[PDB]
CSV table of C-alpha atoms (C1' of nucleotides) and ligand atoms in Angstrom, one decimal:
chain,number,residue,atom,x,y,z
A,1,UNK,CA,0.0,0.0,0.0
A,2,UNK,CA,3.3,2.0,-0.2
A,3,UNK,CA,2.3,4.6,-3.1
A,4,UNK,CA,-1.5,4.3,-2.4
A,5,UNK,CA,-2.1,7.6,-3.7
A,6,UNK,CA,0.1,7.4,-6.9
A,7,UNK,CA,-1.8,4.2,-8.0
A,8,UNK,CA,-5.2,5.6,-6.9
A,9,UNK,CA,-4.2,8.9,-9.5
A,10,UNK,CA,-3.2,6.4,-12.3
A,11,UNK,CA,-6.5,4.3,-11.5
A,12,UNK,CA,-8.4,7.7,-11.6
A,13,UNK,CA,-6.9,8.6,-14.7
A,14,UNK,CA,-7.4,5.5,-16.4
A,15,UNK,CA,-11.2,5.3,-15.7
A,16,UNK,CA,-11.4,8.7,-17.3
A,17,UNK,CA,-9.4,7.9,-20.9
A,18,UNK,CA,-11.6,4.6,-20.9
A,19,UNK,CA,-15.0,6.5,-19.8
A,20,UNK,CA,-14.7,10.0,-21.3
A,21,UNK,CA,-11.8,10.0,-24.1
A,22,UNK,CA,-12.6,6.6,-24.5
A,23,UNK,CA,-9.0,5.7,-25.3
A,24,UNK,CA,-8.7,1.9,-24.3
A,25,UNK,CA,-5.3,1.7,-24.8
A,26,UNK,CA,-4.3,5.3,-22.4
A,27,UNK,CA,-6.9,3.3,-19.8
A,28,UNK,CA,-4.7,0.2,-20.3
A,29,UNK,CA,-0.9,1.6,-20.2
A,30,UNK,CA,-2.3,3.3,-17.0
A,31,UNK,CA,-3.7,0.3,-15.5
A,32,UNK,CA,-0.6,-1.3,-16.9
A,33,UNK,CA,1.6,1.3,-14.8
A,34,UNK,CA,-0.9,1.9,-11.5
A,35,UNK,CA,-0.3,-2.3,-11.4
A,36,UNK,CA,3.4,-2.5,-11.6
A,37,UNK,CA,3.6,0.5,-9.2
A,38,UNK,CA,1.2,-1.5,-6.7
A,39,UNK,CA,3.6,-4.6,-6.4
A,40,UNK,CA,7.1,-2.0,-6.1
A,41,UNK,CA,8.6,-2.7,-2.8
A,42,UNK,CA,10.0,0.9,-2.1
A,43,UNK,CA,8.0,3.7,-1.3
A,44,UNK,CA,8.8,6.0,-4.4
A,45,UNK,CA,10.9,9.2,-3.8
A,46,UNK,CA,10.9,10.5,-7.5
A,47,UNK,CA,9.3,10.2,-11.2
A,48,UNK,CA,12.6,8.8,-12.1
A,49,UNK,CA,12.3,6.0,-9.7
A,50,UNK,CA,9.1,5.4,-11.1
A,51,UNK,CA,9.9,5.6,-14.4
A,52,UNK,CA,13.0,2.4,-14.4
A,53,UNK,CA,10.0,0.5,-13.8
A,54,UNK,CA,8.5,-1.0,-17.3
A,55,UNK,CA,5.1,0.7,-18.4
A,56,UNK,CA,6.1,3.7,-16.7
A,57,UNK,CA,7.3,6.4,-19.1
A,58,UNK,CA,7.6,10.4,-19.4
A,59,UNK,CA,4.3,11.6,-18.7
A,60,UNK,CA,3.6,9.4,-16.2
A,61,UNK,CA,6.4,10.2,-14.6
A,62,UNK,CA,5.8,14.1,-15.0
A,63,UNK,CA,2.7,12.9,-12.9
A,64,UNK,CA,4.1,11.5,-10.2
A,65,UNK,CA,6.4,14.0,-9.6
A,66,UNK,CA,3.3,16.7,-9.7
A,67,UNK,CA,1.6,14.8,-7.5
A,68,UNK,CA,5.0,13.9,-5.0
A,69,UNK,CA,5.1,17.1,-4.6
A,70,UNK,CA,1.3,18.8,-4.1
A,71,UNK,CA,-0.6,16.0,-3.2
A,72,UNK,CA,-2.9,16.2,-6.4
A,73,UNK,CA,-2.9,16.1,-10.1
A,74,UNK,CA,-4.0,19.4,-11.6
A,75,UNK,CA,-5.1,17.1,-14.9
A,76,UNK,CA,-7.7,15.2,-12.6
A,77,UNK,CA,-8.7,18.4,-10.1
A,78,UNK,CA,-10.8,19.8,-13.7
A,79,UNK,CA,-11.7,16.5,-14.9
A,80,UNK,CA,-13.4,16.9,-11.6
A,81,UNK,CA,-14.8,20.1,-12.0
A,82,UNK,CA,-16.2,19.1,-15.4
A,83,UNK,CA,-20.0,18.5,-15.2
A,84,UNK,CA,-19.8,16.4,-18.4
A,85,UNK,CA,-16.9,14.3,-17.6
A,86,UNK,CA,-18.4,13.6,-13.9
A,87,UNK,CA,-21.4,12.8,-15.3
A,88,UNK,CA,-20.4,10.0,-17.8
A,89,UNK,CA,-17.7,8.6,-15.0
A,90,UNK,CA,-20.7,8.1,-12.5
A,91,UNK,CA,-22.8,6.3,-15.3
A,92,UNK,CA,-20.3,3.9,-16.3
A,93,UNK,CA,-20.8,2.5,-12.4
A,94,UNK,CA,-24.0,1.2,-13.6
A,95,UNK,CA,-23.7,-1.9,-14.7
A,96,UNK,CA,-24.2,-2.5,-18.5
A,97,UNK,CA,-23.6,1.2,-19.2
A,98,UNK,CA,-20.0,1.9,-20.5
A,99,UNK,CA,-18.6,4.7,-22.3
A,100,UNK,CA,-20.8,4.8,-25.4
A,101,UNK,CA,-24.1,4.3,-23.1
A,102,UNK,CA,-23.1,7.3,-20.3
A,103,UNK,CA,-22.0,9.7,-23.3
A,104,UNK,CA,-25.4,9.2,-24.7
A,105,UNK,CA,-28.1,9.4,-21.8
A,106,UNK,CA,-25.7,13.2,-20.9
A,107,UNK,CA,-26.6,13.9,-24.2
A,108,UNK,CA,-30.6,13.9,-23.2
A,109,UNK,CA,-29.9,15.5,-19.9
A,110,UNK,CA,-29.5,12.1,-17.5
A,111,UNK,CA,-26.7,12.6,-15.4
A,112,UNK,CA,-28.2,11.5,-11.7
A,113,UNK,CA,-29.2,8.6,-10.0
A,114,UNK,CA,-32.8,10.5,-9.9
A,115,UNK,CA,-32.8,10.3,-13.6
A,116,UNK,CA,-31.8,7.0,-14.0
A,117,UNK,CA,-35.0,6.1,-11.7
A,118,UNK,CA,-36.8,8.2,-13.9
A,119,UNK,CA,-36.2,7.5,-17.2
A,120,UNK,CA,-36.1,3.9,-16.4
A,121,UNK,CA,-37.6,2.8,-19.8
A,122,UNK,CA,-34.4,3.7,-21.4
A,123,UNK,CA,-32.4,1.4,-20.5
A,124,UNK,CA,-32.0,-2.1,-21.6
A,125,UNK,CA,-32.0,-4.8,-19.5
A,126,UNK,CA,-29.0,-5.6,-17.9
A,127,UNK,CA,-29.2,-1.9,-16.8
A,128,UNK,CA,-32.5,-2.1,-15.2
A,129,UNK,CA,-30.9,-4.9,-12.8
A,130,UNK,CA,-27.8,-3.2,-13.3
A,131,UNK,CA,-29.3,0.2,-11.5
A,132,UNK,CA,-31.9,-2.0,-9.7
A,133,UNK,CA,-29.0,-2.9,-7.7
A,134,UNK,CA,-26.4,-0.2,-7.8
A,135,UNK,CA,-25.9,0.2,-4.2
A,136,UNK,CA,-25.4,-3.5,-3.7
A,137,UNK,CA,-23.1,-3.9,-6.4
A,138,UNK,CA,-20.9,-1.2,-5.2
A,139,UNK,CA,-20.4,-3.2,-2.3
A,140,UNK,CA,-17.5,-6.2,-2.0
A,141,UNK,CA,-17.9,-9.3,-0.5
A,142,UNK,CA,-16.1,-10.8,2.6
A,143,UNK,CA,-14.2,-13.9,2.0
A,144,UNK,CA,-16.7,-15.4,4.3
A,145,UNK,CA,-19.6,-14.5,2.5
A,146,UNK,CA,-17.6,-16.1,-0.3
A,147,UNK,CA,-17.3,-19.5,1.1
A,148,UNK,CA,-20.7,-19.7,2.1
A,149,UNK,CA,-22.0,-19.0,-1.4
A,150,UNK,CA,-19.7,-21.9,-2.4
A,151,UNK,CA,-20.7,-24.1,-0.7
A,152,UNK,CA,-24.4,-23.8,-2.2
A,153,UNK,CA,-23.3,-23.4,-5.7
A,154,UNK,CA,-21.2,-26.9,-5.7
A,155,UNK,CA,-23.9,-28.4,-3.3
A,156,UNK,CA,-26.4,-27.4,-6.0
A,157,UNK,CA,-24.5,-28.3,-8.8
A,158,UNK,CA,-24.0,-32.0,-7.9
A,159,UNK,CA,-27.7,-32.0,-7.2
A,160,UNK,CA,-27.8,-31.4,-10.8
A,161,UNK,CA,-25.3,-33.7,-11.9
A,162,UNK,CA,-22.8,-35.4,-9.7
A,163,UNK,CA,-20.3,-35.3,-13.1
A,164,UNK,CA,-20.3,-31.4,-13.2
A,165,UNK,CA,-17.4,-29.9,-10.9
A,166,UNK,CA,-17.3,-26.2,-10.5
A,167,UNK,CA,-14.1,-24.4,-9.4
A,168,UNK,CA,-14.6,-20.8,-8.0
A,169,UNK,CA,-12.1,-18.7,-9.6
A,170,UNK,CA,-11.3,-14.6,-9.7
A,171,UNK,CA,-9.7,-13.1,-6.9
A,172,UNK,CA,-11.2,-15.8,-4.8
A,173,UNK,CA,-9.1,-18.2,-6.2
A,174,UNK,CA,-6.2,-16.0,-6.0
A,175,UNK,CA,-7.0,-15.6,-2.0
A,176,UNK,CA,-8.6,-12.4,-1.6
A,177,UNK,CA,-9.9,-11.2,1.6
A,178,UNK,CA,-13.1,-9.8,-0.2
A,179,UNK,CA,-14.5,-9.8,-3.9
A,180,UNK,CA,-16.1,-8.0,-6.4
A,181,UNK,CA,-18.4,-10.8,-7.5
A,182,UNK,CA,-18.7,-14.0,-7.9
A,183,UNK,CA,-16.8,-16.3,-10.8
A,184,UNK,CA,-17.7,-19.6,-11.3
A,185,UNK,CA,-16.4,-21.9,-13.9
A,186,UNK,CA,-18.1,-25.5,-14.8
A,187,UNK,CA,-17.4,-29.0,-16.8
A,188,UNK,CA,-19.6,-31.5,-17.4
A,189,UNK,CA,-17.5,-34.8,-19.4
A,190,UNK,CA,-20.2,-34.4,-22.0
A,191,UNK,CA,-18.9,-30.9,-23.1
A,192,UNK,CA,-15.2,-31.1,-24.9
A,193,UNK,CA,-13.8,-29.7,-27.4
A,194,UNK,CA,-15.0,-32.7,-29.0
A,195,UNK,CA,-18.5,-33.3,-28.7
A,196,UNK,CA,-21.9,-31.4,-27.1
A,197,UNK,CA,-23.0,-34.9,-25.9
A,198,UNK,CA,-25.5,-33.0,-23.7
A,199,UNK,CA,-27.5,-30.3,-24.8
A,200,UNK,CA,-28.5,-27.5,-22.2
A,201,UNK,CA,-25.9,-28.4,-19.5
A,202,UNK,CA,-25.7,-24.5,-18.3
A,203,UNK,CA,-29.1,-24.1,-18.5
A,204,UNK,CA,-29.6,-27.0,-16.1
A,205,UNK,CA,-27.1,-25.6,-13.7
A,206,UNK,CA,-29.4,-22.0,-13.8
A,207,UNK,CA,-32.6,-23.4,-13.3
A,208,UNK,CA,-31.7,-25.3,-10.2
A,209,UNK,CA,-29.8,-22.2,-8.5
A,210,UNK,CA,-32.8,-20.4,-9.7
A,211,UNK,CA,-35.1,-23.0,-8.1
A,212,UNK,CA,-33.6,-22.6,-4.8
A,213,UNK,CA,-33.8,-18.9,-4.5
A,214,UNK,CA,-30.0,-18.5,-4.8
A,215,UNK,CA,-29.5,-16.9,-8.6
A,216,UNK,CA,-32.5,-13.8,-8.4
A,217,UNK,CA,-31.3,-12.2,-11.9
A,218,UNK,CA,-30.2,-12.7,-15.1
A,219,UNK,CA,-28.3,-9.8,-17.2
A,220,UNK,CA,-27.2,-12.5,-20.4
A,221,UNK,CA,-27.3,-16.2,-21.0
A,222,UNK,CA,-25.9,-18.3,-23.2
A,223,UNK,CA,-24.9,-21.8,-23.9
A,224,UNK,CA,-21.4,-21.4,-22.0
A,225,UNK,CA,-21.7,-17.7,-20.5
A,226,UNK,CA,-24.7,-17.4,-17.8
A,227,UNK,CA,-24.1,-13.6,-16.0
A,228,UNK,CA,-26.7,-12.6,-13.3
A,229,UNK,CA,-27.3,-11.7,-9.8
A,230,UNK,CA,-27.4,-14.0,-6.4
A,231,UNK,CA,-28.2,-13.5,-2.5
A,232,UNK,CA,-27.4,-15.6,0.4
A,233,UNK,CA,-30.2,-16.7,2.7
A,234,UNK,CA,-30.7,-14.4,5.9
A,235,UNK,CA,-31.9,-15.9,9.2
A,236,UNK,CA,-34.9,-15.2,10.7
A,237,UNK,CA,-34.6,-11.4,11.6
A,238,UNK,CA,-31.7,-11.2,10.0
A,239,UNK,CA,-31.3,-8.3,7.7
A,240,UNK,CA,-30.9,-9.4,4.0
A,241,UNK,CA,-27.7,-9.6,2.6
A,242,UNK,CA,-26.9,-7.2,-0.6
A,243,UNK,CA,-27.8,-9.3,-4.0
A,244,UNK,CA,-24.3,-10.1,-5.6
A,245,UNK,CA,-22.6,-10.5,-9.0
A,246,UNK,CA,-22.4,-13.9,-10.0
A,247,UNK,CA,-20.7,-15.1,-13.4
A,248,UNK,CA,-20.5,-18.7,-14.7
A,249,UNK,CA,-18.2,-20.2,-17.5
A,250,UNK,CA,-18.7,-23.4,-19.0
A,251,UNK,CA,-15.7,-24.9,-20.5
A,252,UNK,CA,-14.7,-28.1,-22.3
A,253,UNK,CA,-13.2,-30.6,-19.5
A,254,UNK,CA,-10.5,-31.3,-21.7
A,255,UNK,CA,-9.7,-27.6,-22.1
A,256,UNK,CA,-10.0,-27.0,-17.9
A,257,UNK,CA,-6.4,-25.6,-17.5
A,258,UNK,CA,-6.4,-22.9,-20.0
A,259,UNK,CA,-10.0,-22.6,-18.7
A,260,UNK,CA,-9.0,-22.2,-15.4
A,261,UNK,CA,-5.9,-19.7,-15.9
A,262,UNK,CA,-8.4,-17.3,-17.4
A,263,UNK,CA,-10.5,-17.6,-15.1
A,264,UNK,CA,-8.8,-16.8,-12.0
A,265,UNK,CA,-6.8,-13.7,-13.6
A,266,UNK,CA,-6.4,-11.3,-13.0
A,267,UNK,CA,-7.1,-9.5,-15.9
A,268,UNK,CA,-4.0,-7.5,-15.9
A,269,UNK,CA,-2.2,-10.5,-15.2
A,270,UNK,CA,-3.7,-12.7,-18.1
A,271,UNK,CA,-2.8,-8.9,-20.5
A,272,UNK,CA,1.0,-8.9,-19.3
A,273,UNK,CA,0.8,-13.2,-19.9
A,274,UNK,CA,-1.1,-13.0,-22.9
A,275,UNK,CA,1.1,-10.1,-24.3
A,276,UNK,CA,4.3,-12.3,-24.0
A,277,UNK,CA,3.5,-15.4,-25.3
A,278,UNK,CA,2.9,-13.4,-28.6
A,279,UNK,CA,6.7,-12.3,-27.8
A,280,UNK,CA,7.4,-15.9,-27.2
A,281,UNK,CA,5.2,-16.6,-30.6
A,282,UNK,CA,2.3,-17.8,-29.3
A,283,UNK,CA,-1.1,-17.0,-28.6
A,284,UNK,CA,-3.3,-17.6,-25.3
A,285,UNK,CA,-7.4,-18.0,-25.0
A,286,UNK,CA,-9.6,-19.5,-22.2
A,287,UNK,CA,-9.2,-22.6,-24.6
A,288,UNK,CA,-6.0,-23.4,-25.9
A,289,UNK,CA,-2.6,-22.5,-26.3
A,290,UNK,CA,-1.3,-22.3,-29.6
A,291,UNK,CA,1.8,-20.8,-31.7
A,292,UNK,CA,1.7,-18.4,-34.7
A,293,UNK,CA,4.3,-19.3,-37.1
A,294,UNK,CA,5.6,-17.2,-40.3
A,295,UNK,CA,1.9,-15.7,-40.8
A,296,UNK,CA,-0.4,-14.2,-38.4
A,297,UNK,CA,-2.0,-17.5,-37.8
A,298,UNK,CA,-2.5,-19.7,-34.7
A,299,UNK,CA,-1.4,-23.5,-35.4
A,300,UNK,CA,-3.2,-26.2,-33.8
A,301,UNK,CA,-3.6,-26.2,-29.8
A,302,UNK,CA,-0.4,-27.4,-27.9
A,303,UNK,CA,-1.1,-30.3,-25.6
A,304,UNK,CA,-1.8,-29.0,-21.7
A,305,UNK,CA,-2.2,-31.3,-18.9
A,306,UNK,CA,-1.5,-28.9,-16.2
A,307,UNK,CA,-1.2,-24.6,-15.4
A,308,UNK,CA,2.1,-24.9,-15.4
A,309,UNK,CA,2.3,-26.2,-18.7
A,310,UNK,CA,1.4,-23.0,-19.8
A,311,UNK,CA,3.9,-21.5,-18.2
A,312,UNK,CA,6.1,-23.6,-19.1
A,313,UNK,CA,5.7,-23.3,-23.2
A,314,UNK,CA,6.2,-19.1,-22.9
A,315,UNK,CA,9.4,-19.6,-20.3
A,316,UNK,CA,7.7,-18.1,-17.7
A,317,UNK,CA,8.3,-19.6,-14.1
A,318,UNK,CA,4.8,-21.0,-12.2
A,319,UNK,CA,3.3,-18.4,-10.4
A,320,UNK,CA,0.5,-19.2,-7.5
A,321,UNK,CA,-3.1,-17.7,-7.6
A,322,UNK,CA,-2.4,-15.4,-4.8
A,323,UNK,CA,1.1,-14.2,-6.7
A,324,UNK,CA,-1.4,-13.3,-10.1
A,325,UNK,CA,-3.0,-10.3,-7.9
A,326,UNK,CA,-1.7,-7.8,-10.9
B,1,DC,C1',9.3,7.2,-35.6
B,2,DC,C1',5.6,3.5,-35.9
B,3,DG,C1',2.8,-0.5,-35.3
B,4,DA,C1',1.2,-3.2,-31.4
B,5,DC,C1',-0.8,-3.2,-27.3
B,6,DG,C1',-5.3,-10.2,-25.0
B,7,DG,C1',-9.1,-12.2,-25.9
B,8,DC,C1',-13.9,-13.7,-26.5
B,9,DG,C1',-19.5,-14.6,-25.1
B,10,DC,C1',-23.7,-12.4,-25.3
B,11,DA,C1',-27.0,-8.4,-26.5
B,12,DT,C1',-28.3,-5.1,-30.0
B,13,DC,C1',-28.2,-3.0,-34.2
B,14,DA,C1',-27.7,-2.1,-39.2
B,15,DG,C1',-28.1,-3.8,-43.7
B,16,DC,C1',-29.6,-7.3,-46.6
C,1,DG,C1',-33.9,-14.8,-40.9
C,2,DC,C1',-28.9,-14.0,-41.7
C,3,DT,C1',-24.0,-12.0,-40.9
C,4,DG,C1',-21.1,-8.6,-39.3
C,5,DA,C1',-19.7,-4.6,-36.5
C,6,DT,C1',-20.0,-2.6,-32.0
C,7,DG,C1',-21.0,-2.2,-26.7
C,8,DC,C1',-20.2,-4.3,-22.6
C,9,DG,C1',-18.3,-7.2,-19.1
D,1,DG,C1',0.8,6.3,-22.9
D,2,DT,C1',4.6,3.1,-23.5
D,3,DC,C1',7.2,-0.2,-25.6
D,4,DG,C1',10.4,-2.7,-29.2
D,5,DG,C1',12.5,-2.9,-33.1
E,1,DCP,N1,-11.1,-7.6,-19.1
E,1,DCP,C1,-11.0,-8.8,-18.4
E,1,DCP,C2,-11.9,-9.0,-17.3
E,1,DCP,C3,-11.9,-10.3,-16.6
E,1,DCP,N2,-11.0,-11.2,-17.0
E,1,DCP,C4,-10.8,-12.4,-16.2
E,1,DCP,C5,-9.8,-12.7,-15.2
E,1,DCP,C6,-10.5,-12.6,-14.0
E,1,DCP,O1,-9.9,-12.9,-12.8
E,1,DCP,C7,-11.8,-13.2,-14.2
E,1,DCP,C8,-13.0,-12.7,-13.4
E,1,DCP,O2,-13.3,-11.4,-13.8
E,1,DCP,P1,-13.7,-10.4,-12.6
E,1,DCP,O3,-14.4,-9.2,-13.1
E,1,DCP,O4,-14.6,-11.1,-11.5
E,1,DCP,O5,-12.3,-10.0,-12.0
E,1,DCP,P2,-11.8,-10.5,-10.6
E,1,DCP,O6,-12.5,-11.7,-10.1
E,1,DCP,O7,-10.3,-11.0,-10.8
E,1,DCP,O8,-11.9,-9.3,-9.6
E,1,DCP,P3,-13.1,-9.0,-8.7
E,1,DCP,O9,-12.9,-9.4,-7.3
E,1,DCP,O10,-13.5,-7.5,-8.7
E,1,DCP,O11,-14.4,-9.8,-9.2
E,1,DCP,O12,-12.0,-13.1,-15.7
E,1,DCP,C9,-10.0,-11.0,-18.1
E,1,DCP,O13,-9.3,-11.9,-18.4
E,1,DCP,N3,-10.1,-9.8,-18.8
E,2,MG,MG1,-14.7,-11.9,-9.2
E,3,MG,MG1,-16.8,-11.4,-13.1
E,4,NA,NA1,11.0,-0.4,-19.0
E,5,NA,NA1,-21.0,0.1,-16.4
DNA sequence: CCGACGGCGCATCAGC
DNA sequence: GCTGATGCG
DNA sequence: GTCGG
């Protein structure tokens, strides 16, 4: 937490390149920066210091060496003055509504929480559960909270089927105190890369944590993609708990490892890995690893029996989940 | 300087 | 109905 | 915005 405030200004300035500029690749090289800041060991004295670092160049370290020395960014104090710019960040915290979404509704005069409410019939609908449940959303969830959803998904699940295993993954599998959300991944031995044996085996997997009051919401669904919302049971009295993010990946079993390094991330993480296996020559997906040779064209999948072989092909020492926090 | 910067499932839309 | 491009996570 | 060639 050394240089808390630097990575906070590079986060802030990222969200506003992706959001306003809508620049994905400024948002990325300072999401690429803000994470190799967060993992330095020293508390930074200097730009330069922040700049031997890799993904760190001139601006940013004109930045840090503003902000070393005021405490603030000049750049972000009028991106927070701007109405327009305010308004399209706080938007984009609704989920389903990105840049191109929270550019438009400013453009008819919604810019408030009120608004939102109010014009309700303009939104699509993952953004109807997506403001529905704004508050909850914003909130993490405890690591405790976390096993006890766990439980019910895998306890549900082999209701189902007792061949489906599900693997919680994100920064859950990485060992995170708390959590966004909720990520799920699932095999069945009828789904490979070979064959759809079974038709509907998602579905199945839906309508039973449906049944049991666990999944409450659905923002998209398809045959190997199921996003939505979930709530733990309360006791009697209790207060509710919030309603949570909960995402679930189906992936064929004999594609589980590449399945499973995607899954638990991070994102940043699976960019810097992804990133250099193309400057190893190869390229990475949930599904397969594979090299590009001569042309600009993926070969057939390597053969993967474990997450380290992965690692192994691009020359990269294993890391553990809870070393992959980028 | 200049091209590349990870990758893909689902929802929605335009254009047939 | 498609297919393909774009928004979004 | 930053990197590699
Ligand atoms: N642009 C992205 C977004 C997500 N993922 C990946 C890796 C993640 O770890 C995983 C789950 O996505 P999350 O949004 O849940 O990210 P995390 O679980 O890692 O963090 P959080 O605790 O906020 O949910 O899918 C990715 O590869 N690229
Ligand atoms: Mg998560
Ligand atoms: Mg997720
Ligand atoms: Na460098
Ligand atoms: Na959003």
């Amino acid at each position: 937490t050394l240089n808390g405030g630097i990575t906070d200004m590079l986060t802030e300035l990222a969200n506003f390149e992706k959001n306003v500029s809508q620049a994905i690749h400024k948002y990325n090289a300072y999401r690429k920066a803000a994470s190799v800041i967060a993992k330095y060991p020293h508390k930074i004295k200097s730009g330069a210091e922040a700049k031997k670092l890799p993904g760190v160049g001139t601006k940013i370290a004109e930045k840090i060496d503003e902000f070393l020395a005021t405490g603030k960014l000049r750049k972000l104090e009028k991106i927070r003055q701007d109405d327009t710019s305010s308004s399209i960040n706080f938007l984009t915290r609704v989920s389903g509504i990105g840049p191109s979404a929270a550019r438009k509704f400013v453009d008819e005069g919604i810019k408030t929480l009120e608004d939102l409410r109010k014009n309700e019939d303009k939104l699509n609908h993952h953004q109807r559960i997506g403001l529905k449940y704004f508050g909850d959303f914003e909130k993490r969830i405890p690591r405790e909270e976390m096993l006890q959803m766990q439980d019910i998904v895998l306890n549900e699940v082999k209701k189902v089927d007792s061949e489906y295993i599900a693997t919680v993954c994100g920064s859950f599998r990485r060992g995170a105190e708390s959590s966004g959300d909720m990520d799920v991944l699932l095999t069945h031995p009828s789904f490979t890369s070979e064959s759809t044996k079974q038709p509907k085996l998602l579905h199945q997997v839906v309508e039973q944590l449906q049944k049991v009051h666990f999944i409450t919401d659905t923002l998209s669904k398809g045959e190997t993609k199921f996003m939505g919302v979930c709530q733990l049971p309360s006791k009697n009295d209790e207060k509710e708990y919030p309603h949570r993010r909960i995402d679930i990946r189906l992936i064929p079993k004999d594609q589980y490892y590449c399945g499973v390094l995607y899954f638990t991330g991070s994102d940043i993480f699976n960019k810097n890995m992804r990133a250099h296996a193309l400057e190893k020559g190869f390229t990475i997906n949930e599904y397969t690893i594979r090299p590009l040779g001569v042309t600009g064209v993926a070969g057939e999948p390597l053969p993967v029996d474990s997450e380290k072989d992965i690692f192994d092909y691009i020359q990269w020492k294993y890391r553990e989940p809870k070393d992959r926090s980028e």
